[PDB]
Amino acid sequence: AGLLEGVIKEKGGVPVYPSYLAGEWGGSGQEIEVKSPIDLATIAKVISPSREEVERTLDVLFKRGRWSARDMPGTERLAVLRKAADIIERNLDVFAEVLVMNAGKPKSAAVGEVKAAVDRLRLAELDLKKIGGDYIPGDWTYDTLETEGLVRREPLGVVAAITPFNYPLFDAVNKITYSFIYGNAVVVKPSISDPLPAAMAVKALLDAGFPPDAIALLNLPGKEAEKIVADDRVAAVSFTGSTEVGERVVKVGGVKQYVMELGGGDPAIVLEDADLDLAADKIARGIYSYAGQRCDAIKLVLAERPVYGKLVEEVAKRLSSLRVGDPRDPTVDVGPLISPSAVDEMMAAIEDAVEKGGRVLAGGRRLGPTYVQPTLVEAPADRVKDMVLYKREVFAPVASAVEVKDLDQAIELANGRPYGLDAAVFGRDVVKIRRAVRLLEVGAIYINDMPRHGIGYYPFGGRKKSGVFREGIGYAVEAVTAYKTIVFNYKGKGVWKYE
Amino acid sequence: AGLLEGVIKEKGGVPVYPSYLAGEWGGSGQEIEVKSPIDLATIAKVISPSREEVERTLDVLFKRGRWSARDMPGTERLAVLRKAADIIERNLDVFAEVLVMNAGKPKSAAVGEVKAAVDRLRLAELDLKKIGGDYIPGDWTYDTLETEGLVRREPLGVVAAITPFNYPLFDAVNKITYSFIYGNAVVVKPSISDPLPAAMAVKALLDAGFPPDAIALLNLPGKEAEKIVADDRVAAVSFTGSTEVGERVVKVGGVKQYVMELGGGDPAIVLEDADLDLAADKIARGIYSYAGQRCDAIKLVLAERPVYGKLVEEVAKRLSSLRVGDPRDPTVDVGPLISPSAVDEMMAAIEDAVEKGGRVLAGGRRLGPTYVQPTLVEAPADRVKDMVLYKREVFAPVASAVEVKDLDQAIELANGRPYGLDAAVFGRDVVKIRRAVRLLEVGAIYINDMPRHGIGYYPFGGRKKSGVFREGIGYAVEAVTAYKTIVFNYKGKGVWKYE
Amino acid sequence: AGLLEGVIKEKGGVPVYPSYLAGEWGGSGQEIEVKSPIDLATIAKVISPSREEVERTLDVLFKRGRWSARDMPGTERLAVLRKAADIIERNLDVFAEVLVMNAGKPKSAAVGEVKAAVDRLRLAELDLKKIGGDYIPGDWTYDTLETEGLVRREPLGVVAAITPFNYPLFDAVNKITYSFIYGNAVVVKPSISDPLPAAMAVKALLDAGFPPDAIALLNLPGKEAEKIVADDRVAAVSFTGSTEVGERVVKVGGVKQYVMELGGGDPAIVLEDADLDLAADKIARGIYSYAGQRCDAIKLVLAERPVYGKLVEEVAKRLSSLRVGDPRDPTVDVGPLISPSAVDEMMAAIEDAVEKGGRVLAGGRRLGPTYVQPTLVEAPADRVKDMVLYKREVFAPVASAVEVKDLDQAIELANGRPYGLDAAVFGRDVVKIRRAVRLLEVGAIYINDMPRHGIGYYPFGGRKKSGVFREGIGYAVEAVTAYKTIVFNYKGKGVWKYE
Amino acid sequence: AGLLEGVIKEKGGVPVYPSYLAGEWGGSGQEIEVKSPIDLATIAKVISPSREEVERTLDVLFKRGRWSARDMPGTERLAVLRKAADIIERNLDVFAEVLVMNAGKPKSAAVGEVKAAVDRLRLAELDLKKIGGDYIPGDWTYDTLETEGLVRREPLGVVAAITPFNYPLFDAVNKITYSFIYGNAVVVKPSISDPLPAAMAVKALLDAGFPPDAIALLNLPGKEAEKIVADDRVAAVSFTGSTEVGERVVKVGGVKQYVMELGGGDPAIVLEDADLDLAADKIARGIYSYAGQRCDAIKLVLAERPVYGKLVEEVAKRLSSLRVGDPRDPTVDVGPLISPSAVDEMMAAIEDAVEKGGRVLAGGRRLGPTYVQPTLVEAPADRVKDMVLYKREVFAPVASAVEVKDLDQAIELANGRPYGLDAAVFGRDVVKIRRAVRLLEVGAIYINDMPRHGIGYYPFGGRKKSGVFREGIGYAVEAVTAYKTIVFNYKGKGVWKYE
């Protein structure tokens, strides 16, 4: 609605959302149904581009787009991003509604994501703490005397932004922002599961002045996107999703610049030192927020003997007092999961933990094809490692709780999972905290708080199976930019006497 | 000889070089013959590790090596690198000899590479202009108030260094240096074509104090290395080689941090402004140095109408006055190519240019299975683009020469190849130079000089098919290092009043 | 008018502007007449604070102000600066009028300064490319093992901003912006000659949300300001003015952080290579803009034999075709000088040049107590050095022109003055330009353009008698900020194994 | 002895040390007696230069020196500094002896300073993490489109290094190192009290290859140095000394770049959280090291109620168990103070504290004209602020001890002195530590350790009366370097399309 006034096709009673082919909205490939996880009902259809349209779109992005983006003064690109922020802001409710409608996101969360997208856009000003270059004098080596170097960052060209389902609006806006602020053209490929928010963001950007040939939004389902990734006109692939799909993306893409935010869960460690009120509060939230459909969601709780009982007790009470229902009730805390399949896996996973010695301390009851109570499962250290909930990321509101002897055991268990995205540590002793910070093999550690990538004010990314590289204001530049070195030779000319 | 005193096996009359399995020299896989391109005679054999030894080596590097490298104080790692420099230096002649023996490198060039390796090691001090981290205050956003960020760079763990044949000693030393200075363990995989220099460097490093379990040298032929690349204990792959093999490496490795120096040739542009003496001199060298077996070798010469004649004339004279023979004669300018196959391709390539309108202006005569004269082939702009010498990188001493109307045509042709490593521009006008610098799509541009990565005093790397990321003192850190973000939450505590 | 609605006192027919005493507008010291250089008529009066009010103001700034500025989140300080930009923008005409009224600035120039002030405020976002800190690992020295360093920049406290007459609005806004963006409180001391624009800027800032106790505007005449400079509650003095007054400021202030932009003229060099059209245009402007009352004004023109004639010819024609009159005529090019005294000095200076062999090539005629034609005086290299116009900065629209043999003589003469603010070089040859850049002893060199500090997009400042330190977006932080180092000792604790 | 073989004049039985006049050792001004604080006996004489020799020396440094230093390739300057390190190292004992002889420094301390000087020299490699420059694109503002900026750091020219008495060798070496590594010429002015170590360092540097006209060592007593400071050929003054002399230096020098390390004492805070063993140990040392003749010496101890008793108890025991005597006994802990006057002030200061309610807890007994026991004086919070030991820096081994209610009172008292050099905080709670770090107004805070500038691995400097700017590896560059901005204008040329 609204922004997509003349774009959306009212056909067969259901709104039809077209792909944006770097110049004109359209598409003539298969139409795909977009369902809401709230009622499993079709809320719209998206037109996927045909193979020829994908080909033509990439051709336009490559031959015209990257130059349109690059030739637009940085000061103007920023203006575009700021105007788009204004547009999204005044259309907040419609944007939030779609997030609730399409992603099953609780009203307040949906509003939070729209605001995050808006802030991210406005902070593009801070993404400049990085586009400056370096000057290198040549007199620190005899071979380089009477020589000089200039190292500048330049945009790579066409960046493919591949987005997961859990933060459809923000991720698209985020990847588009850091790719565009530096002069790249962008091909957005949203999850076919919830591509509507991206269509709205893209539209807002186009209305804001975004070079019409420098951006594309292709509604291609999963494997159909490989055509974009494998193409040589795509210099970089910014991907946020599962470890398995990310692996496939790299293998399909080959040599190319990548940003792989592959998530997985995050462990939380509570030292005997911690404020248990703060810890229980933040840990409970980290477990249930958006029905645990957050890569930075808490999946494992580790607490030392002296505080384990009280901590898990408080977290259990907070979880069980949560209202699960229609994300439309500003009263509901937890909406549905993206699909019934996601819930199936969570139940099977809980069964696995229980079979292996685990005990549910809160939740555990499925409430419908796509509804479940955020669950907390207790587990003995000697058996937790073999449980699916530990070895894998069950994208749902569920976490293991484990009592530990000391910090070293906490760290050991925390590092025992195959992932390494973030980790949380609640405590007050600087030495123990410093040790945890040193030994936790993750991209980010949150001291006295739940893991929260937020809008990327602080850089984040993975270690181990959680991926490579970082996103964040100012740090994402590394993935969508390339250095250009210019060496000047003045040997023999009379510039320098001896140096 | 020398350093490898008790390591090399004198068996069957031929010296047998063993792999270094992160702790002990050995191996029990197939023995492979190492031949000299000077006479095509076997000069040694290398023992490739068996599958179980590769497995065990990776296990050691992962479980012990990365910690030994990381736990060694940076100041000590530097001491090791400096001691190794001392050792290689006093063993210069033996190192140079092997480069001449095994790589067919002219005496002076071999000496140059040993010195480059020595300097690179000693400059590890300058690789520190990057291991420092960032402090991020949280008051530039309301959501981050009473919060702070600390971003540190940490080593990734186990880096796989894969080296090409053309600079066996330097590349190994270089990749080991920047991987180790930051705390990584390293698995070196040299070209089976000339693995001897690496064995000597590794030995020198081990004698210098390099953690014995933090380094490995595996003599595995081509595809046998995929076992190292595909392994999850290898967090990064530093690869220098052909575009095609690099592509295979990424597809085999999957998600991982990469540095892909994929070479290709470099075009040289001469403006009517240029000092033609300097230009002819540098361009001639760029074409023939090490029989053109340099990724930064000149493969295409573009000169404006008014200077084309004189320029190509002078370059032709310099090339034809070159002495081709045994790299052992301090009198020889050009030794043999690495293999007769390499020469076959160069002759076929020349034939192609001639068939398509090209004309040899110098050289063109094969002198033996692995010897050829550095060749310069003239070609009309209207036909050069379809010639193999243009569309491809013929790793040999051969370059196309093309007359152009103006800078724009020079740039067009320069950018018309599928590669984008470096480019050279000879001229004096700041505006034309600035324009060339803006439009040349390459990782590095050399003003008034031949392209020379040298020891990486200035960062270099590719665009387009020449790869991704950069090597260079201080810049290589990006590929073998990862950020670790630590966010401290002080909300509610009495640290800050309002900010 | 406007913003100062309830502030300005309508007394005795003339508007009376009060000082802002960090909380309330007022003052009870001597009232001082403010005259326009357009007609020498009193246009207003300013109330200077009494000694007790200065004392009380400093006390407030120190005891409350620096905390109010520091405790306001950076994100809020930026909001204040942006709101103030909005206010000044919608009040553009009134701001421009006062600049014309009070400074005798040509209409378009006045509009340019208001816009510059507005842009400077809005770019405060880019002043953040510097408030981030550094993290220093301790393992690069054995003595520092198991130790770490955190280096943050903090505001100094109370910064005294002392402004000259030539850019009353911008300078005040500029110094306030970079002092405040980082958390400092500010005491503005404008030239008693034209303090009105500052009063308006300060008012706009206060209306924008600027902490009322964190800013002060004291209308103190010259030496009366020493009371502010000498006070220990003033941690930094940002001063832009004459070399002689700056010297006095430091001697009165003692140990303290300083930014001394002491101006002086700038020499312009034209190589036989230069586009003479561009050169004549830019040089003419550099000589006359704002009746040469610009620290970055061109005061000496040096051109090589082959272009000297044409260059000076064209510059002379441009100068003589200038309309001198009331800055109110959008038709006038040059308004009056700030005072008749300034004109007296310019005439005496011209007389000196003529007596010493100089010859007027354009202008030279005084048109009134405060009006004169922008003048160009030719002079032989062998005598120019002893002329007052060379040895000194005659703040007026006048410049010496001198023919030179080659670049070396140009540089010699350019460096022969006691100043070293900027220098301009018109030419195209990279080698000659690089040499000029190396040998010109100045803070900034402009290639193919007149010197233009502008809003400080690029940092600028002096060498030799032109002062110390730099202003500019991102660079001014050094003068109003201080480092705070935090060293953490973990020796003996179990954080690190060996490193 | 040794290095000064042919330099020192054996006249009248006492060794006569000449000034180094930037080219030749000599001098013809008054000869001055240099006494040892060990026995008050003359151990040598130094020749101060005459006014004409000072004039000539400055002329040489300015006209030749700054170019010799600047024209020497950075790589060579580093070689010089490293060679000098080698020379000082092999002459360690002689250097240490002079420190013991001339400064009354305990044997181990003297050895520590020689080693510090040696390390500082060798770490000059790390002073390079700063001489690189910045490249600034012009498309972030419309006015700067088609424009670019290059900002390089250049040496200022002649730096005057003024050294205090307490670390004669290190300070001279340190200031010379960071001034020279960047290309400056240096005039060293050591304390006439102990100028011998500087003469030896300078000699070692000259033997190492230091440009003979780029360095000078003038033995001028106190006020006689103003001639160097006030001279316009001296672009920067690096001064370490008393607040009062520093003030005089700035007032004599006028506009110039300064580094003012003005010391004062440091307060130490111990939270109920602290390891009291570590705290007592470090605090005791901080109080007595080099008889408290350290700017980073502990002068005030603040401990919370619950640990005050035990802490002060342990510190008292450590102090009273100290052996005071001839610094030559590797058995002595504390040698003499620099002069009997220094001891007089310490006794008077103790008397003052006692008269105002203070009580000596350890030491307090004078042992000779220049010997005293390191003293610890207890004082009630309600009276400590008026005691001389609090309000002033009594350069001697003496500190006040004060019990406090909580962190806020500790901070209040810590900030109540007029100085702000460093501060120490022993404790473990991250929140309390973070708060202390925020509120302590000092240049450096040491967590769980005594303040130790060391060789400047971490930057340090003052706040309030302790001075301005910082010294430290990599940070000292700001004081002896200046930016040079080069702006290139390409407006109208065909470099850029629109951006």
Ligand SMILES: NC(=O)c1ccc[n+]([C@@H]2O[C@H](COP(=O)([O-])OP(=O)(O)OC[C@H]3O[C@@H](n4cnc5c(N)ncnc54)[C@H](OP(=O)(O)O)[C@@H]3O)[C@@H](O)[C@H]2O)c1
């Ligand atoms: N971009 C740069 O900075 C740069 C610098 C120097 C050279 N180069 C390029 O490198 C080439 C010269 O070296 P080269 O001819 O020896 O090229 P190459 O064949 O591409 O070198 C490949 C390296 O990878 C190993 N390898 C081969 N197949 C592999 C596989 N399937 N999996 C894992 N590793 C494998 C090779 O070992 P084996 O030798 O045992 O097969 C060799 O050590 C040229 O194309 C040149 O342009 C680029």
Ligand code: NA
């Ligand atoms: Na590919």
Ligand code: NA
């Ligand atoms: Na993989």
Ligand code: NA
């Ligand atoms: Na003062």
Ligand code: NA
């Ligand atoms: Na002065």
